[PDB]
Amino acid sequence: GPLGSKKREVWTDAEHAKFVEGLALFHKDWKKIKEYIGTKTVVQIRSHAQKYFLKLNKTA
């Protein structure tokens, strides 16, 4: 885990895609995602937890 190191609340492109796992583990439950990435608030997760859905496509 973070081992008490200070973490940024703001996302990164590699950090984002850890959320994309919790969408399966917790199933539409942002109040559990913030633990998987580590010590996050739900604020940036809730606004990005809408963004994953926008990319979904029936052409792959």
Side-chain angles (χ1 to χ4, degrees):
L3 198 70
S5 189
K6 289 291 188 189
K7 296 303 184 180
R8 295 293 185 269
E9 313 309 343
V10 51
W11 283 123
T12 90
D13 67 337
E15 184 180 74
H16 191 48
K18 302 299 187 191
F19 115 127
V20 91
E21 315 290 27
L23 323 185
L25 317 180
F26 320 121
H27 172 56
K28 204 291 190 76
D29 201 2
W30 323 140
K31 284 76 168 282
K32 299 290 293 289
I33 296 181
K34 85 304 192 320
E35 304 311 273
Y36 178 76
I37 293 95
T39 205
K40 291 290 190 180
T41 84
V42 181
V43 182
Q44 340 73 200
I45 291 158
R46 201 147 180 152
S47 56
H48 262 84
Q50 281 175 294
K51 288 285 215 173
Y52 88 83
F53 188 92
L54 304 182
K55 196 178 68 68
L56 293 174
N57 57 90
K58 58 168 67 181
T59 57

